[PDB]
Every structure is written in structure tokens, then in C-alpha cells.
Structure 1
Amino acid sequence: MIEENLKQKIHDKFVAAKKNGHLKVTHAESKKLKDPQTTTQYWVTFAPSLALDPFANPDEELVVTEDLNGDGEYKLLLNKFPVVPEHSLLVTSEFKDQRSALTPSDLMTAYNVLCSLQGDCERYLVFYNCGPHSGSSQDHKHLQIMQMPEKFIPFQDVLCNGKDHFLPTFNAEPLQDDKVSFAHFVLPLPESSDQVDEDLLAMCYVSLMQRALTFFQDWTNESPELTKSYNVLLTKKWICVVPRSHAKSGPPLMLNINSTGYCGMILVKDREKLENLTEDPHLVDKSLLQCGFPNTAGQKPTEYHY
């Protein structure tokens, strides 16, 4: 069960630690962009000062909760050097590898945290960077939770809008936006948290995973396995998985891309890059392709390697 008054606890732990120097906020400014070609909305954050096992012994002043549930599964830590204020890490109490899949209780715990923070009108995102190409910096398993920008509408939203929860089958594949350059898989989630339980979440994740895995494992055995990497993104309205080829993008930007990139949130460290993207928002779409695999919308996962 999720700690009571989690949101106030996060807030209060955060202001206190900013106050006395247990965390320092990196200054940043953000703005909206729109891909003229693909229509996809982006949120670009600019943090110049950035160009100039923490979970083992985390600073107690940063620990919002020792166990997010009754179980010794999870602790909730504040990010020590956040761009987004109150940005938090759900860390496995005991060590596990970040290359491991999300369990069912992982999913239910993350969804419950979202519900708790969202007041049941701010929006929260929960995400997981799995593997070397995901943008994962650390090997100790953790999820991340952060508030999404107030007016930002990620493409997943429009993708899922007015589309009821379902699960994939041979007739119905996960939603994927064809306008975007990159492979991704999304299921809408029920509007009401009463329709959401562990098993629904688990089945959502497994079926998304099976699509994501086809870029790594090959059923024809005409290729040897690759190393698995993917982003999981979870909000209250949908869940999404992105297979990842490279942690960092190619020549013009060379952005480090994590989960947030794939709902369209980009972090840039220098003003030349910031103006490149302003002039040409379509660069983001190109970067997302370099870091992922090309869009598979309208295809059976089975025919990828065949």
C-alpha cells in the first residue's frame, strides 16, 4: 500500500533538502516545439550549466520513504541534481539489475504512485530505462517519476484519445503512430483506476514487451541475439514501450536520449543546439530514429526478420 500523503511528503522533503544543500537544482528553461512534417509536439528544456552506486548509501535527507509499500520492495529517493523539481527515483530496496524486466508488482506500485500524486490537476510520468542503449546511467534497478509540463500534449495522448483500453491479439496490434520515425508500442489504459489491477498492467507490459523484443531476438535464427534495451513509459492514460538501438544520437545534436525523449521531452545542454532545433524541430524526430528502430506500424512482428 502506498505511503499516505506521498505528494506532500515528496514536496516537503524536496523543499527542505533544497534549503540546506542536500540537493541542488540545475537551472533550466523550456519551450514547446512542433514538428512541421510529423506534427508531433515536443518539449525542449535548455540547461547550459550542464555542459560545464548512489542508491547504495543514499543520503537520508533525500529518502522520501524507506519502503514505498509495506514490503521491503521499494524506497523513494529524491534526485540529488534534478532539472525537474521533485523528480524522484523508485529504487529497489535490495540490489537488482536495471537490465531486468519490470515485475507485476513494479507496475502496480508505479501506477499507484501516479494515482497518489495526481490527487485521486497535475500530470505525472513514470519511466524505466532498461539496458545499455536506453540512457540508463546506473545498474541498480530504479524507476523514475516526474511531473510533466503543464501544457504539453505528448503524441501518445492523441494516439490513445477516445480509444478504450484493450489488449493486442492477432487481429488487434498495440497502437503505434505512423507519422513518427521510430518503433513504439502503446496501449491505452482504462479511464478509471477501478478498472486497473496488477494483471491488467502485467498483460499490457508483456504484450508490449513481445513486440519490443523482436528487434533483439530472431525467431528464424538467421541472426544471433542482440542485447536488449528499451524504454518503458507509464502515465495514467496509457503505457508504452520503445525498443532502443543507441543511447546517444548521431551527428547534428548527439543528444543523450532516455525514456522522456520518446514522449517528446528533450534535454539540451548548449545554445547552438537549442537554436538548431528551434529552426528545425524535425531534428528531434530524426534523433529519435537514430536512437531507436524505424517505425513498424501496420506490420506483424513475425515478419520483421523474415
Structure 2
Amino acid sequence: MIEENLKQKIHDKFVAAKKNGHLKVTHAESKKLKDPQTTTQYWVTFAPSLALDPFANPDEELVVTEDLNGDGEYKLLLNKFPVVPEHSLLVTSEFKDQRSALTPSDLMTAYNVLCSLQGCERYLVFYNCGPHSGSSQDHKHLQIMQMPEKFIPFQDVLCNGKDHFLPTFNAEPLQDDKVSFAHFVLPLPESSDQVDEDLLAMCYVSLMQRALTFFQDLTKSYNVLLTKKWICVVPRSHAKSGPPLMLNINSTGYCGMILVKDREKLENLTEDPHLVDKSLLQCGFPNTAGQK
């Protein structure tokens, strides 16, 4: 059960922290890129400045709510070093570990926050899980950030024209065969009324099956991305990319959202955006789909 006008409180809360220093907004410039080989759309943010247990007792100036739901499980914090204004942490009240799986509560809580903020705005929710996921913090936390105003992540196109399903013997999760990386995507019911705790648990664990098999033949690492339109699970072999790019990558980069700290890199992606693909390959596993 989400707090009322939770947007306003996040907005009300951020405008302050920015003013008094309790958080600091890195400047960035961002541009869209399209993959000529794969058709995938890339949103590339440039922040050269970045080239230059806090969730236990975070500055209260940073704490939107002490308990998100009626339950005493979650606070809501503001990322103290935002690139996208207002990026929020969903944080466990009593410490849990980031290696820990997501629970029916976690997903619905987060989904309900999606529904609060989304009352052309769009929001992304992700979880970096494991040494290789892009995680910098062990206190379990989920992330919520605005996605880009005009941007079409490939999950969308793979997900449109396809009504919600839980995999049927004649059906797997949805997986784009064009791209380099293994990933798993399921469509969600459009009106949030068709969406509840048990449905996501199904979705998540299901996805989690296919995901898990990428170890049993490195400690399990992966990304979860969740939007009102779909849920997606990515298995992760590395945190940072290979030799061309040496990019650090978290859940966002698997809807195509990339954060680079130096200009040459920005240029090289611009010259050849498909390198992004190879990077998600380097941090991922090779793709499967088109098969069973």
C-alpha cells in the first residue's frame, strides 16, 4: 500500500536536497543511437565529471519515506549522486543482502511505485544482483529512475503485439534474437488492475529459471528491469565490458541505456553503435532465442 501523492513527496524531497548539498547532480549530455546491425535503440549519456552501509542511517534530508508500504520493510531514499534528477532507492528497513532474491512483496511494492509516478513520462525499475551485476552496495536496494522522454527500448517492440502469457509448452519467455546477449522478457497486463503479487512472482521466478541455468552446467549475478509494460531478467558474467570499451554496466544498459565518462568512448560509440551490442555481449552471455 503506497503513500498518497508519492510523486510530490519525491519531488518535494529532491528540490531541497539539491539546494543544500545533501545530494549533488552530475551534469550530463545524452544522445540516442541506433544499431545498424541489430536495430536496437541506444540512449547514451556523457558525464566526463564522473571521470573524476549508507542505507542503514542515510541523511534524513535524503529520506522520502521511512516506510513505503504499511509494512516496516522499505524506506525510500534519494540517490545522493543523481545523473537523472530524482533517481530513488527502494531500501530494506532492516538490512538484507543484495545477493538475495526478490520476493513477491519487493516486486509489487516497486510496481506500485511505478503506478504512483505514472499516476509521456515513463519510469524504470531495476535490481543489480551479484558481483557482476553492476552493484556497488550490499544492503538490498531497488532502483527507480525516469527513462528518456523519446526513447524506445527493444523490450518494447519485442513485447508489442504479444498479449500477456506465462510460458506455455508452446511458449517460452520473449527473447529478441537480433541482439548479442541472453535476456528474458515477459509482457505485463496493461491496466494495473490485472497485476498483483502472485502474477509477478510467477513472472520473476519463471524468468529466474532460465536465468539460473547460466551457471549450473561464478556466483549468480544478474539484472532485473521492470516497467509497467514488462519485466526482464538478465544473467551477468561481468560488470565491466571488454577491450574496446571497458564499460561498467548495470541493469539500465540492458534496455540500452549507457553511461560513459569519457569523450573518445562517446565518439567511438557514435562512429560504431553496434559496439554497444558487443559490450552487452561481453558483460552478458551469447543469445539463444529462435530455438526452444
Q: TM-score by structure 1 length?
A: 0.94
1:290 partnered with 2:289: no
Q: SS in structure 1 opposite 2:24? A: coil
Query: What is the Cα deviation at residue 129 of structure 1?
Result: 0.3
Query: What is the Cα deviation at residue 278 of structure 1?
Result: 0.5
Q: Structure 1 CA distance, aligned partners of 2:146 and 2:224? A: 16
Q: After superposition, what is the alpha-carbon deviation per residue over 1:91-139, rounded to whole angstroms, capped at 9, x for unaligned? A: 00000000011000001101000000001x3100000000001001111
Query: What is the Cα deviation at residue 60 of structure 1?
Result: 0.3
Q: Structure 2 CA distance, aligned partners of 1:69 and 1:57? A: 19
Query: What is the Cα deviation at residue 46 of structure 1?
Result: 0.1
Q: Structure 2 CA distance, aligned partners of 1:227 and 1:24? A: 33
Q: After superposition, what is the alpha-carbon deviation per residue over 1:23-68, rounded to whole angstroms, capped at 9, x for unaligned? A: 1100001000000000100000000000011111100000000000
Q: Structure 2 CA distance, aligned partners of 1:142 and 1:52? A: 25
Q: SS in structure 2 opposite 1:163? A: coil
Aligned to 1:221: none
Q: SS in structure 2 opposite 1:80? A: coil
Q: Structure 2 CA distance, aligned partners of 1:241 and 1:175? A: 11
Q: SS in structure 2 opposite 1:288? A: helix
Query: What is the Cα deviation at residue 252 of structure 1?
Result: 1.2
Q: After superposition, what is the alpha-carbon deviation per residue over 1:111-168, rounded to whole angstroms, capped at 9, x for unaligned? A: 000000001x310000000000100111110000000000010000000012110011
Q: Structure 1 CA distance, aligned partners of 2:168 and 2:102? A: 22
Number of residue pairs the alignment of both structures matches: 292
Query: What is the Cα deviation at residue 217 of structure 1?
Result: 1.8
Query: What is the Cα deviation at residue 20 of structure 1?
Result: 1.1
1:299 partnered with 2:275: no
| Aligned sequence identity (%) | 100
Query: What is the Cα deviation at residue 169 of structure 1?
Result: 2.9
Q: After superposition, what is the alpha-carbon deviation per residue over 1:199-233, rounded to whole angstroms, capped at 9, x for unaligned? A: 11110001000000000123xxxxxxx41111000
Q: Structure 2 CA distance, aligned partners of 1:298 and 1:209? A: 19
1:255 partnered with 2:247: yes
Q: Structure 2 CA distance, aligned partners of 1:62 and 1:103? A: 25
Query: What is the Cα deviation at residue 2 of structure 1?
Result: 0.4
Q: Structure 2 CA distance, aligned partners of 1:15 and 1:76? A: 16
Query: What is the Cα deviation at residue 296 of structure 1?
Result: 1.1
Q: SS in structure 2 opposite 1:12? A: helix
Q: SS in structure 1 opposite 2:176? A: coil
Q: After superposition, what is the alpha-carbon deviation per residue over 1:268-299, rounded to whole angstroms, capped at 9, x for unaligned? A: 00001000000000010000000000001034
Q: Structure 2 CA distance, aligned partners of 1:71 and 1:130? A: 24
Aligned to 1:197: 196
Q: SS in structure 2 opposite 1:71? A: coil
Q: After superposition, what is the alpha-carbon deviation per residue over 1:240-279, rounded to whole angstroms, capped at 9, x for unaligned? A: 0000000000111111000000000000000010000000
Q: Structure 2 CA distance, aligned partners of 1:74 and 1:31? A: 34
Runs of 4+ in 1 over 3 A off after TM superposition: none
Q: Structure 2 CA distance, aligned partners of 1:74 and 1:199? A: 20
Q: SS in structure 2 opposite 1:166? A: coil
Aligned to 1:73: 73
Q: SS in structure 2 opposite 1:144? A: strand
Q: Structure 2 CA distance, aligned partners of 1:24 and 1:136? A: 20
Q: Structure 2 CA distance, aligned partners of 1:13 and 1:110? A: 19
Q: After superposition, what is the alpha-carbon deviation per residue over 1:54-83, rounded to whole angstroms, capped at 9, x for unaligned? A: 111100000000000111110000000010
Query: What is the Cα deviation at residue 171 of structure 1?
Result: 1.7
Task: Output the aligned Cα RMSD.
Answer: 0.7
